[PDB]
């Protein structure tokens, strides 16, 4: 009659070892030693209850974090993709910028060699204009000297025309003798007049002509302004180029420093890719680790 | 009577097991009586529990691990996220100083282009001016040629007047003193004719000088003409070249704008990951906590 209860308690233990936690523990009301032991066992049953409970909450917590890492992961993923896409868009561009910079530098270096060329052919043309200016001055002098001497020949004609008067008057001193004389004096007069005609034609021609040299002189002189002016505008072109070259090998070393920061960045993007794959693996591992913990106490029927 | 000692003892064994203490073997398994059966029962439970405990201990250690891994995984990410921020700094800075120089270029191109075109207009007006000179020279020269032809008539007349007067003088002084009078007049005509012939030679040789200088000068302005031609086609080439730089600098500034935008896109990303960094420090601390709860749920803690 002690046999019956302690066997019953033994069964109770068994029933607990199978994970049956919800059944009452018998004999807790006895005030004999059996009661002490039943109480011990009810205490066991309670202590197991709380443990399964804790483990189960632990499993569900972790299943929660697994799920949270996961969705935090799926973000960093497509967000990291976005980054690598953005990063190639900027790689593409820095390649175009080196292309365009290198070209602009050669294109400046051309213009410069080209302008110095204009400069040097303008200076040569400068010196050829000098010579022309000079030779115009000479022509101007010669031409005035011609005006001068032709006016003298007009004088002589006038004068020899006057002597024809005297020769006529000296001829008529022997009428019938100075008849031939009279003809000569006539001839002289005729020769003077034609000779004056020629003189005056030349006056017209030479005065006109003098007009022309002075005009041609101002034209040639301006042709020299022109050379000076070109040289000037073409030099300022050469400077402008010196400056473009300087801002180009400048842009060159700045593109350069950017390509470097970009290598940095696709290195870190690459790593974020790695981090993502790993983080997915961690999540999976956590999920299964909660599965195992749940399974470890799942036979237990509680409360 | 006697057998209340093992009752109490078993009670104590059960309180150890409840307390999380499993290492002690249960006594009284050797009895044939009912106690023995129960001691065996406690033994079966003890050993089942050791096993359940151990999976759970293993569970938590795996969480502790997982967590501190996620943690270090997250410290690297943090330092790559500042490293990324700092890189994106330099980049933005470099686009700044490179957006400056692209503008400086479009300006200096514009400014060169004008200078070139300015010389182009000049060297072209220049060519029109050289043309006018070559024409004036032809004028000057046609005229001199005309003057030559007439000067020659004045020479002719001088010649004729010389002979006319020399014959008249001769035939008058032949008459004695009766024709001394005429002889002197004829004589002064001969001298006047001599002067006039000499004047006309001086003009003839001055005309020679002019014409010669005209041909020469004319050949020289021709070449000046062709040097302005050469300049035009040079500066024109330079104008074309500036066009090509206005281009570069335009597609460049579009390059800066793609990069500008993409650098912003990656500014978003950088800040978002900073969010991720501490969000996940915090997941890692929470995982560490569940591991802790799990080991403590099953520790020998004297509960
Ligand atoms: Cl450039
Ligand atoms: Cl053992």
UniProtKB/Swiss-Prot annotation, chain B:
It is found in: Cell inner membrane. Keywords: Cell inner membrane, Cell membrane, Chemotaxis, Membrane, Methylation, Transducer, Transmembrane, Transmembrane helix. GO terms for biological process: cell motility; cellular response to amino acid stimulus; chemotaxis; detection of chemical stimulus; protein homooligomerization; protein trimerization; receptor clustering; regulation of bacterial-type flagellum-dependent cell motility. Residues 50-303 are cytoplasmic. The modification Glutamate methyl ester (Gln) is found at residues 83, 97. One of its GO terms (molecular function) is transmembrane signaling receptor activity. Disulfide bonds: none annotated. One of its GO terms (cellular component) is methyl accepting chemotaxis protein complex. Residues 59-288 form the Methyl-accepting transducer domain. The modification Glutamate methyl ester (Glu) is found at residues 90, 279, 288. Receptor for the attractant L-serine and related amino acids. Is also responsible for chemotaxis away from a wide range of repellents, including leucine, indole, and weak acids. Chemotactic-signal transducers respond to changes in the concentration of attractants and repellents in the environment, transduce a signal from the outside to the inside of the cell, and facilitate sensory adaptation through the variation of the level of methylation. Attractants increase the level of methylation while repellents decrease the level of methylation, the methyl groups are added by the methyltransferase CheR and removed by the methylesterase CheB. Belongs to the methyl-accepting chemotaxis (MCP) protein family. This is Methyl-accepting chemotaxis protein I. It comes from Escherichia coli (strain K12). The gene is tsr. The chain holds residues 264 to 517 of 551 of the full protein.
């Amino acid at each position: 009659t002690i046999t019956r209860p302690i066997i019953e308690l033994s069964n109770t233990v068994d029933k607990i070892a199978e994970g049956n936690l919800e059944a009452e523990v018998p004999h807790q009301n006895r005030a004999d030693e059996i009661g002490i032991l039943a109480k011990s066992i009810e205490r066991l049953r309670r202590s197991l209850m709380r443990t399964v409970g804790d483990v189960r909450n632990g499993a569900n917590a972790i299943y929660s974090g697994a799920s949270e890492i996961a969705t935090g992961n799926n973000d960093l993923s497509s967000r990291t993709e976005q980054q690598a896409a953005s990063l190639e868009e900027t790689a593409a561009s820095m390649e175009q910028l080196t292309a365009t910079v290198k070209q602009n530098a050669e294109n400046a270096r051309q213009a410069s060699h080209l302008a110095l060329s204009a400069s040097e052919t303008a200076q040569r043309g400068g010196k050829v204009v000098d010579n022309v200016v000079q030779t115009m001055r000479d022509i101007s002098t010669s031409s005035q000297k011609i005006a001068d001497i032709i006016s003298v020949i007009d004088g002589i004609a006038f004068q020899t025309n006057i002597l024809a008067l005297n020769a006529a008057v000296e001829a008529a001193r022997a009428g019938e003798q100075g008849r031939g004389f009279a003809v000569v004096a006539g001839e002289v007069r005729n020769l003077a007049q034609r000779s004056a005609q020629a003189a005056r034609e030349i006056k017209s021609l030479i005065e006109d002509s003098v007009g022309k040299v002075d005009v041609g002189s101002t034209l040639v002189e301006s042709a020299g302004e022109t050379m000076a002016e070109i040289v000037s505008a073409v030099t300022r072109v050469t400077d402008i180029m010196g400056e473009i070259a300087s801002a180009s090998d400048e842009q060159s070393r700045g593109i350069d420093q950017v390509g470097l920061a970009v290598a940095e960045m696709d290195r870190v993007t690459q790593q974020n890719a790695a981090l993502v794959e790993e983080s997915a693996a961690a999540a999976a591992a956590l999920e299964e680790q909660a599965s195992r913990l749940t399974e470890a106490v799942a036979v237990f029927r509680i409360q």
